[PDB]
């Protein structure tokens, strides 16, 4: 089976392909509409293997240097190996010797084509956690966002670093383990600094300090500052927002770090609860008169602070990508904080970007501790300082990367002219990454095809690694093999690997013709592999291996990733920030919202996405990534209100309405971006979230409208 | 044969010493300010207050430019008034404020003709008519006593109060009461000598001793603390932490104070987290290894904490050594040495950078007054760092090459008389005269944007400020010369109060009488302010040119004008100026306008500073010494030992003496010193066994020593600073500093040789 392909392929490899057989001309594989791509997970959950102690193997070509992998031919009798991806001869190192043909090491094996192998640097760095604190807020949040940091501080390693940094009016940068009194050092909430004038003004030297000590050595200390911290003391003035420098903060945590502990694992945890009213970075003004952006604003160009501000983050963000450092933030708060404007950050390292009502709800707290998840051996599911190398066979080169990831501008054979996304690259720089951080990589054409994926990093226990992954899919005659390369489409693949190419140019200036080219290639697609009499829409059909296809760029144009102006900019940011991130499992849903039915007439089944599924004796269950929501049939709505439940005689009746709420749990703990929860009904104000989600190619319209009008273009 | 400074001094403490002085006549003239008498106000205002040049102005402006004697007045407007003289006495006259001259301004005073039943009043001094308000009114008796007049004191005495209402507030809102801004350099320099510890161990009993009237229980001035070297750290001391806070800022030239709360609070209240604080800042900077400090942005910090809190206040700065770091206020060593022949000579007595004038401006313009408490050991630039302090009001307090073991009790006797100082706050004071002159020029630790207003931002008892008066119009011999000095300002309690004092001057257009109300002490303050402001403006030999000059000119028209025929061979003064030429040639003597070789600038600057903040007692004594004979010392006489002439002929070789200027004392020893009176005082046997540079106090001593000690607290009594004691031994010893205070001796030119100097000039104004 071709679905036992991809599904074995994606739990061993970490990859998903859009096709997985490769067409060997340049020309039909341009004339094949999709590009041959990749989601790739580079730290995909595998307990089955165990970390080889020793070190890798390369490849004496220089400009190669490729990890020895069960491709490469061998000659045990002369203990030398072929390089799959240039044919160089290499010779094995002398401890392998006693290699034989029956008793071969791991990466020789197929059944570890992608593995993790064990370095030994020598520099073993602890890891650094620096919190930067916002104070313009209620005691409530406050005291409740001094829980949460208590409750992390409590879960790190005894040889962490920590670093604690709060701000409002004014930036206080702490000095902790000094007992007895508490100095900290003051800046002006307004003026911007450099990583060199910080250095020089907290007097320290070049390249543990007084502001980065051990957990175990300041536990006390610090856990007690934490619990006398208090709001920002300066008053706010009526219409008027409290004097907020989270600009001029982030570019203190950034340099503070630049300056003492430059390309070594480090978060930077910058929580908010509210907007920038006093730049660098500012968001928007200081009196309430003036509401923040409106995606309606930043578009009749009413908003004068988003380009300013979103500079100022653009190369904070891109200091500590540069440096190695991970930027957090955790935007809990009842209006925008300026997520638009400070996306860059988490979304240029592998930081997570929360959003939140405020930091004293169950929302928030539970989502705050899933960051520091233990494994099975109490180590974080962390990664950092990430180095990502792709070697390619020599009839393919990539065109660039799209996710979580900074460009190191490796120039190679491997790099292709036509460079898409992040792209005029053979690596790129993931600062921070867990085992769900999914690339997309894009490649080109110009027996088997291979592609090798190597990825340096710092584990979460001071152990610097090298993941490995190693995959080949058959070469292809598109003249006599056009049936071959058709079954090894993947619908789903494709579908997430051309909705992120489309965002990422929603990102770009281009605009609304991202729906434009999107119907384009649904079209150009039809009309390739589709079974059709020309200008016969009736005769129109598509093989199962792309039947759900159009049906995923339908929800994809129609998604609140595209359709921003039913969101604030904020919200909008948050949306495309995780579904950059995700695997295509957790990917699919965001694009096509998952609905489940249940009812005394058997067991609890998906459904369609549309209006015929809701029916008076079912209760739904829809899944979008981001929110749950339970909608009761209005049948079962009244017998709900009546009281039915509690009585005895209806104990089938308490379990249908617990059938739901039981699953409802489950994703609730599981799920690392905790959803928002929605229990509504038939008639709820709250109704609303469901029916919502269930030239240009067409408008608004039903699914059915979508595909006739798609049927009649693709057949003429 | 001239009569000496001390025949003079005697001679007057002995016809108008132990005598009433009752201020009734106009234009009386005041004994001099050696001579201690008893003074009623009576309708003008007392010496203390306010003393002049000359107490009988010429009717016009040519014979003034006859004489060519300064019209002028040394005015110490808070001076301390002895315990057996009468009080000042706080007027109030409600809402309406005090009543005043709807032309010239002048404040109702002795000096306002009441007329036409009492319902009128002409001003004495534009000669203005006002209708007396419903409130004040009051029915006229036989010539105009109005009945009230030994009632009110603004109508009976010279010196009172006025209450001020609002609208002579700032904002028009009642102000609040100041704060005490403590800052201490805390760089390797005073860490080592123990000077930190010092400060901090001792400002734990003295912070008690901070000034509260009797009206309320506890001082309402608050407090804080701030440290620094190169970097400030200020702090938190909040009447609610268990542990002070501390704030570092690195920010140094565009500084702030990251506090608004925690900072400035009620001693009482904070009292135990203040002296948790006290005891760790000694601790806390002992391993510090800073060799540079910053400066201006110190000022700017304290004086931005005070225009956040709404309030005035003092800057209490303990400082080191030079300034280096670099930051605004940046110094260095600029110690190139032009002089004599040089025009530019004066830089050197100027700041270098141009931000101290702005500093200080900010400070004189939000009520925050700077004293400096400064211990240099090396060039520290006193022309820059002083000039905050002295534009401000404030005090400046040098101690050369401090050593522990010697200036510490000179230090600490400094420091609580500076804290415990009745002090005013944001105060500003107007001279304004009657029809036909007119204040023209300033002279003290004051500041000036316009030509009318003095602003003081803070003034103390021992400040004094010198006006000089010129001809507006002819004068009238009748009506004469009427001076109101006002001085506006806010209590240590927070209240709006004005302080006035009437003095009323003959007016002649005789020669003859302008000599003859001349006092001798009060033109010599006039002529040594005028000179030492001059030295940032001209070549000293010019302005020395000048007062020979001027003194020539003086005598000479005393000469041929209203002395009775003599011979060319005498030269004639009147008994007024008897003293002036000897004076005179001491102000020529002085450092200040003398030169570099053997004195630093450092010192010239100090000293010139020094002089223009002096009332008339204290400008009389710097500039002529006082040498107490000891050992022709009557035992238990013991009334205080005649003074003896300021020369070493006056010196015996078994002889001790006393010489005090009021800043510097001096124990002196001859090689034949009896050995009673060395045992009886050292507690060592002989002369040759006393060390010079073990200078501290001699407490044991059964008979003499007690006794020798007793007139050096007397000395020490009516004086601001206490003065560093200086033991010398009589030959090739330290006595080379000790001989400069000899002021009748060579060293410039002698006395004789002077008044030789000035016989010449005035024989050659020819006529
Ligand atoms: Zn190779
Ligand atoms: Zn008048």
Same mark, same amino acid.
């Given at each position: 089976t071709?679905?036992?392909?991809?599904q074995?392929?994606?739990?061993?490899?970490?990859?998903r392909?859009?096709w997985?057989?490769?067409?060997?001309?340049?020309?039909?594989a341009?004339?094949?509409?999709?590009?041959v791509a990749?989601?790739?997970?580079?730290?995909?959950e595998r307990p089955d293997?165990?970390p080889?102690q020793?070190? @890798?193997?390369?490849c004496?070509?220089?400009?190669?240097?490729?990890?020895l992998?069960?491709?490469?031919?061998?000659?045990?009798?002369?203990?030398?190996?072929?390089?799959?991806?240039?044919?160089?001869?290499?010779?094995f190192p002398?401890?392998?010797?006693?290699?034989?043909?029956?008793?071969?090491?791991?990466e020789?094996?197929?059944?570890?084509?992608?593995?993790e192998?064990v370095v030994?640097?020598?520099?073993?760095?602890?890891?650094?956690? %620096?919190?930067?604190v916002?104070?313009?807020?209620?005691?409530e949040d406050?005291?409740?966002?001094?829980e949460?940091?208590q409750?992390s501080?409590?879960?790190?390693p @005894?040889?962490?670093?920590?670093g604690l940094?709060?701000?409002?009016?004014?930036?206080?940068?702490?000095?902790?383990?000094?007992?007895?009194?508490?100095?900290?050092?003051?800046?002006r909430?307004?003026?911007?600094?450099?990583?060199?004038?910080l250095?020089?003004?907290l007097?320290?030297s070049?390249?543990?300090?007084?502001f980065?000590? @051990?957990v175990?050595?300041?536990?006390?200390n610090?856990?007690?500052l934490?619990?006398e911290?208090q709001r920002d003391?300066?008053p706010?003035?009526?219409?008027?927002?409290?004097?907020?420098?989270?600009?001029?903060?982030?570019s203190?945590?950034?340099?503070?770090?630049?300056?003492?502990?430059?390309n070594?694992?480090?978060?930077?945890?910058?929580?908010?609860?509210?907007?920038?009213?006093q730049?660098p970075?500012?968001?928007?003004?200081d009196?309430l008169?003036?509401?923040?952006?409106?995606w309606?604003?930043?578009?009749?160009?009413?908003?004068?602070?988003?380009?300013?501000?979103?500079?100022?983050?653009?190369?904070?963000?891109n200091?500590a990508?540069?440096?190695?450092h991970?930027?957090?933030?955790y935007?809990?708060?009842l209006?925008?904080?300026?997520l638009?404007?400070?996306?860059?950050?988490?979304?240029?390292?592998?930081?997570?970007?929360?959003?939140?009502?405020?930091?004293?709800?169950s929302l928030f707290?539970?989502?705050?501790?899933?960051?520091?998840?233990?494994?099975?051996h109490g180590?974080?599911?962390?990664g950092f300082?990430?180095?990502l190398?792709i070697?390619?066979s020599?009839?393919?080169?990539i065109?660039?990367?799209?996710g979580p990831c900074?460009s190191?501008?490796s120039?190679?054979?491997?790099?292709?002219?036509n460079?898409?996304?992040?792209?005029?690259?053979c690596?790129?720089?993931?600062c921070?990454?867990?085992?769900?951080?999914?690339?997309?990589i894009?490649f080109?054409?110009?027996?088997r095809?291979?592609?090798?994926?190597?990825t340096?990093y710092?584990?979460?226990?001071?152990q610097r690694?090298?993941?490995?992954?190693?995959?080949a899919?058959?070469?292809?005659?598109?003249?006599?093999?056009?049936q071959?390369?058709?079954?090894?489409?993947?619908?789903?693949?494709?579908?997430? %690997?051309?909705a992120? %190419?489309?965002?990422?140019?929603?990102?770009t200036?281009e605009?609304?013709?991202?729906?434009?080219?999107?119907d384009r290639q649904?079209?150009?697609?039809?009309?390739?592999?589709?079974?059709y009499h020309?200008?016969? @829409?009736?005769?129109?059909?598509?093989?199962?291996?792309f039947?759900?296809?159009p049906?995923?760029?339908?929800?994809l144009?129609?998604?609140?990733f595209?359709?921003?102006?039913?969101n604030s900019?904020?919200e909008?940011?948050?949306?495309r920030?995780?579904?950059?991130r995700?695997?295509?499992?957790?990917?699919?849903?965001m694009? /096509?919202?998952? %609905?489940?039915?249940?009812?005394?007439?058997?067991?609890?089944?998906?459904?369609?996405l549309?209006?015929?599924?809701?029916?008076?004796?079912?209760i739904?269950?829809?899944?979008?990534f981001?929110?749950?929501?339970?909608?009761?049939?209005?049948?079962?709505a009244?017998?709900?209100?009546?009281?039915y439940?509690?009585?005895?005689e209806?104990?089938?009746?308490?379990?249908?309405? /617990?059938?739901?709420?039981?699953?409802?749990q489950?994703?609730?703990?599981?799920?690392?971006?905790?959803p928002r929860?929605?229990?509504?009904?038939?008639?709820?104000?709250?109704a609303?979230?469901?029916?919502?989600?269930?030239?240009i190619?067409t408008?608004?319209?039903?699914?059915?409208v979508?595909?006739?009008?798609?049927?009649?273009?693709?057949?003429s | 044969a001239?009569g000496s400074?001390?025949?003079?001094?005697?001679?007057?403490?002995?016809?108008?010493?132990?005598?009433?002085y009752?201020?009734?006549?106009?234009?009386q003239?005041?004994p001099?300010?050696?001579t201690?008498?008893?003074i009623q106000?009576?309708?003008?205002?007392?010496?203390?207050?306010?003393r002049?040049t000359?107490y009988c102005?010429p009717c016009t402006?040519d014979?003034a430019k006859?004489?060519?004697?300064?019209?002028?007045?040394?005015?110490?407007?808070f001076?301390?008034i002895?315990?057996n003289?009468?009080?000042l006495?706080?007027?109030?006259?409600?809402?309406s404020?005090?009543?005043?001259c709807?032309?010239?301004?002048?404040?109702?005073?002795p000096?306002?003709?009441?007329i036409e039943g009492?319902?009128?009043?002409?001003?004495?001094?534009?000669?203005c008519?006002?209708?007396?308000?419903?409130?004040?009114?009051?029915h006229?008796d036989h010539i105009?006593?109005?009945?009230? $007049?030994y009632?009110?004191?603004?109508?009976?005495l010279?010196?009172?109060?006025?209450?001020?209402?609002?609208?002579?507030?700032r904002?028009?809102?009642?102000?609040?009461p100041?704060?005490?801004?403590?800052?201490?350099?805390?760089?390797?320099?005073?860490i080592?000598?123990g000077?930190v510890?010092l400060?901090?161990?001792?400002?734990?009993?003295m912070l008690?001793?901070?000034?509260?009237?009797?009206q309320?229980?506890?001082?309402?001035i608050?407090?804080?603390?701030?440290?620094?070297?190169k970097?400030?750290?200020?702090?938190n001391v909040?009447?609610?932490?268990?542990?002070?806070?501390?704030m570092?800022?690195?920010?140094?030239?565009?500084?702030?104070?990251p506090?608004?709360?925690?900072?400035?609070?009620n001693?009482?209240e904070?009292?135990?987290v203040?002296?948790?604080?006290?005891?760790?800042?000694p601790?806390?900077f002992?391993d510090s290894?800073?060799?540079?400090?910053?400066?201006?942005?110190?000022?700017?910090?304290?004086m931005?904490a005070?225009?956040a809190?709404?309030c005035?206040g003092?800057l209490?700065?303990?400082h080191?050594?030079?300034?280096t770091?670099?930051?605004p206020?940046?110094l260095?060593?600029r110690?190139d040495?032009?002089?004599?022949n040089?025009d530019?000579?004066?830089?050197?007595?100027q700041?270098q950078?141009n931000?101290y004038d702005?500093?200080?401006?900010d400070?004189?313009?939000?009520?925050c007054?700077?004293?400096?408490?400064?211990?240099?050991?090396?060039?520290?630039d006193?022309?820059?760092?002083?000039?905050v302090?002295?534009l401000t009001?404030?005090t400046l307090?040098?101690?050369?090459?401090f050593?522990?073991?010697?200036?510490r009790?000179?230090?600490?006797?400094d420091?609580?008389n500076? *804290?415990?100082?009745?002090i005013?706050?944001?105060?500003?004071?107007?001279?304004?005269?009657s029809t036909?002159?007119?204040?023209?020029?300033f002279?003290?630790?004051?500041?000036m944007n316009?030509?009318?207003?003095?602003?003081?931002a803070?003034i103390?008892?021992?400040?004094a400020?010198?006006?000089?008066?010129? $001809?507006?119009?002819?004068?009238?011999?009748?009506?004469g010369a009427?001076?109101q000095?006002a001085?506006?300002?806010?209590?240590?309690?927070?209240?709006?109060?004005?302080?006035?004092?009437?003095?009323?001057?003959?007016?002649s257009?005789?020669?003859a009488?302008?000599y003859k109300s001349?006092?001798?002490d009060?033109?010599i303050?006039?002529?040594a302010?005028?000179a030492?402001?001059?030295?940032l403006?001209?070549?000293?030999?010019?302005?020395?040119?000048?007062?020979?000059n001027?003194?020539?000119?003086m005598l000479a028209?005393?000469?041929?004008?209203?002395?009775?025929?003599?011979a060319?061979?005498?030269?004639?003064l009147?008994?007024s100026?008897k003293?002036?030429?000897?004076?005179?040639?001491?102000?020529?003597?002085?450092?200040?306008?003398?030169?570099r070789?053997?004195i630093?600038?450092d010192?010239?600057?100090?000293?010139?500073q020094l002089?223009?903040?002096?009332?008339?007692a204290?400008?009389?004594?710097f500039f002529?010494?006082?040498?107490?004979?000891?050992h022709?010392?009557?035992v238990?006489?013991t009334?205080?030992?005649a003074?003896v002439?300021?020369?070493?002929?006056?010196l015996?070789?078994?002889g001790?003496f006393?010489l005090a200027?009021?800043?510097?004392?001096?124990?002196?020893?001859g090689?034949?010193?009896?050995?009673?009176? *060395?045992?009886?005082?050292?507690?060592?046997?002989?002369?040759?066994?006393?060390?010079?540079?073990?200078?501290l106090?001699?407490?044991?001593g059964?008979?003499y020593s007690?006794?020798?000690?007793?007139i050096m607290?007397?000395?020490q009594?009516?004086?601001?600073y206490?003065m560093?004691?200086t *033991?010398?031994?009589?030959?090739?010893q330290?006595?080379?500093?000790?001989?400069?205070?000899?002021v009748?001796?060579?060293?410039?030119?002698?006395?004789?040789?002077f008044?030789?100097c000035?016989?010449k000039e005035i024989?050659?104004?020819?006529?």
């Open positions: 071709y679905l036992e392909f991809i074995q392929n994606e739990e061993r490899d970490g990859v392909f859009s997985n057989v490769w067409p060997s001309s340049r020309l039909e341009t004339r094949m509409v999709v590009p990749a989601l790739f997970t580079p730290l995909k293997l165990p080889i020793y070190e @890798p193997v390369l004496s070509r220089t400009t190669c240097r490729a990890v992998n069960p491709l490469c031919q061998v000659d045990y009798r002369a203990k030398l190996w072929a390089c799959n991806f240039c044919y160089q001869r290499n010779q002398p401890s392998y010797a006693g290699i034989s043909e029956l008793n071969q090491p791991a020789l094996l197929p059944q570890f084509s992608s593995i192998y030994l640097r020598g520099p073993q760095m602890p890891l650094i956690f %620096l919190y930067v916002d104070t313009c807020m209620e005691d406050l005291q409740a966002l001094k949460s940091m409750m501080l409590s879960l790190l @005894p040889t962490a670093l920590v940094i709060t701000f409002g009016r004014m930036v206080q940068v702490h000095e902790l383990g000094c007992e007895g009194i508490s100095k900290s050092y003051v800046f909430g307004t003026k911007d600094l450099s990583a060199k004038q250095q020089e003004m007097g320290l070049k390249v543990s300090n007084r980065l000590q @051990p175990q050595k300041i536990d006390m610090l856990t007690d934490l619990g911290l003391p300066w706010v003035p009526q219409g008027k927002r409290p004097l907020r420098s989270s600009g001029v903060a982030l203190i945590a950034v340099g503070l770090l630049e300056c003492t502990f430059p070594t694992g480090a978060r930077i945890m910058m929580f908010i609860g509210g907007p920038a009213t730049g970075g500012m968001v928007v003004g009196e008169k003036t509401p923040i952006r409106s309606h604003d930043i578009d009749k160009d009413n908003a004068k602070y988003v380009k300013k501000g979103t500079k100022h983050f653009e190369a904070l963000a200091r990508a540069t440096t190695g991970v930027i957090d933030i935007a809990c708060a209006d925008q904080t300026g638009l404007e400070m996306k860059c950050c988490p979304n240029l390292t592998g930081g997570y970007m929360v959003m939140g009502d405020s930091f004293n709800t707290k539970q989502t705050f501790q899933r960051v520091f998840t233990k494994d099975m180590q974080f599911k962390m300082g990430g180095t190398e070697k390619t020599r009839e393919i080169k065109s660039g990367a799209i900074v190191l501008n120039k190679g054979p491997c790099v292709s002219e460079e898409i996304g992040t792209g005029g690259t690596q790129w720089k993931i921070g990454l867990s085992p769900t951080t999914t690339l997309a894009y080109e054409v110009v027996g095809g291979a592609i090798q994926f190597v340096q710092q584990h979460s226990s001071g690694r090298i993941r490995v992954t190693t995959i899919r058959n070469w292809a005659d598109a003249q006599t093999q056009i071959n390369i058709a079954a090894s489409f993947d619908q789903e693949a494709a579908a997430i %690997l051309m992120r %190419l489309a965002i990422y140019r929603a990102e200036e605009g609304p013709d991202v729906l434009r080219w999107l649904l079209i150009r697609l039809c009309q390739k592999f589709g079974e020309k200008d016969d @829409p009736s005769s129109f059909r598509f093989s199962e291996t039947s759900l296809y049906q995923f760029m339908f929800h144009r129609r998604s609140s595209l359709q921003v102006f039913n900019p904020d909008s940011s948050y949306y920030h995780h579904f950059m995700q695997d295509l499992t957790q990917s699919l849903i694009i /096509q919202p998952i %609905l489940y039915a249940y009812s005394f007439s058997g067991p609890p089944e998906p459904v369609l549309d209006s015929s599924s809701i029916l008076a004796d079912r739904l269950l829809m899944d979008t981001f929110q749950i929501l339970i909608y009761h049939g209005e049948t079962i009244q017998w709900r209100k009546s009281g439940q509690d009585m005895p209806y104990e089938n009746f308490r379990h249908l309405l /617990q059938a739901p709420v039981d699953d409802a489950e994703i609730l703990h599981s799920r690392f971006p905790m929860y929605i229990d509504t009904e038939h008639g709820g104000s709250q609303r979230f469901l029916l919502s989600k269930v030239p190619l408008d608004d319209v039903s699914l059915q979508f595909m006739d009008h798609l049927k009649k273009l693709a057949v | 001239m400074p001390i025949q003079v001094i005697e001679n007057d403490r002995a016809s108008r010493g132990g005598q009433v009752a201020t009734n006549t106009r234009g003239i005041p001099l300010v050696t201690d008498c008893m106000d009576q309708g003008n205002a007392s010496p203390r207050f306010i002049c000359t102005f402006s014979m006859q004489a060519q004697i300064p019209l002028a007045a040394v005015i110490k407007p001076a301390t002895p315990s003289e009468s009080p006495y706080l007027v109030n006259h409600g809402e404020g005090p009543v005043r709807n032309r010239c301004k002048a404040y109702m005073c000096f306002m003709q009441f009492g319902r009128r009043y002409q001003c004495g001094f534009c000669n008519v006002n209708d007396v308000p419903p409130f004040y009114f009051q006229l105009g006593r109005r009945l009230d $007049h009632e009110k004191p603004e109508l009976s010279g010196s009172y109060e006025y209450v001020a209402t609002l609208d002579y507030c904002k028009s809102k009642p102000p609040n100041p704060a005490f801004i403590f800052m201490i350099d805390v760089s390797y320099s005073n080592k000598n000077l510890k400060i901090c161990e001792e400002l734990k009993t008690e001793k901070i000034p509260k009237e009797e309320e229980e506890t001082s309402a608050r407090v804080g603390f701030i440290t620094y070297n970097v400030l750290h200020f702090f909040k009447s609610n932490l268990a542990q002070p806070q501390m570092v800022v690195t920010d140094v030239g565009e500084v702030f104070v506090l608004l709360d925690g900072f400035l609070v001693y009482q904070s009292q135990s203040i002296h948790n604080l006290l005891d760790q800042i601790d806390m002992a290894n800073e060799n540079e400090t910053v400066f201006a942005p110190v000022i700017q910090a304290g931005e005070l225009k809190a709404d005035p003092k209490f700065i303990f080191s050594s030079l300034p770091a670099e930051a206020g940046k260095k060593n110690d040495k032009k002089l004599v040089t530019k000579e004066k830089i050197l007595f700041p950078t931000v702005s500093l200080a401006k400070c004189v313009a939000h009520g007054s700077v004293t400096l408490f400064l211990f240099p050991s090396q060039y520290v006193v022309a820059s760092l002083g000039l302090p002295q009001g404030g307090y040098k101690y050369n090459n050593q522990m073991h010697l200036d009790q000179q230090f600490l006797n420091l609580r500076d *804290i415990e100082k009745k005013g706050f944001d105060a500003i004071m107007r001279v304004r005269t036909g002159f007119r204040a023209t020029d002279f003290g630790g004051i500041l316009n030509t009318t207003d003095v602003e003081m803070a103390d008892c021992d400040k400020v010198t006006v000089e008066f010129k $001809h507006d119009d002819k004068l009238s011999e009748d009506s009427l001076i000095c001085v506006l300002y806010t209590t240590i309690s927070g209240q709006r109060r004005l302080r006035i004092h009437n003095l009323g001057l003959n007016c257009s005789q020669l009488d302008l001349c006092e001798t009060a033109l303050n006039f002529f302010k005028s030492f402001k001059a030295v403006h001209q070549p000293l030999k010019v302005i020395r040119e000048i007062l020979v001027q003194t020539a000119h028209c005393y000469r041929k004008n209203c002395a009775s025929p003599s060319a061979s005498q030269l004639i009147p008994d100026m003293v002036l030429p000897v004076y005179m040639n001491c102000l020529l003597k002085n450092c200040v306008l003398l030169s070789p053997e630093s600038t010192e010239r600057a100090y000293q010139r002089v223009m903040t002096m009332g008339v204290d400008s009389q004594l002529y010494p006082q040498l107490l004979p000891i022709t010392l009557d238990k006489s009334m205080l030992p003074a002439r300021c020369s070493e002929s006056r015996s070789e078994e001790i006393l200027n009021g800043l510097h004392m001096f124990l002196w020893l090689v034949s010193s009896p050995p009673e009176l *060395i045992q009886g005082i050292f507690n060592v046997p002989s002369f040759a066994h006393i060390n010079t540079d073990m200078t106090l001699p407490e044991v059964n008979p007690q006794q020798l000690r007793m607290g007397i000395i009594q009516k004086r601001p206490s560093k004691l *033991i010398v031994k009589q030959r090739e330290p006595e080379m500093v000790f001989r400069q205070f000899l009748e001796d060579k060293g410039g030119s002698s006395y004789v040789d008044l030789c000035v016989h024989c050659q104004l020819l006529n």
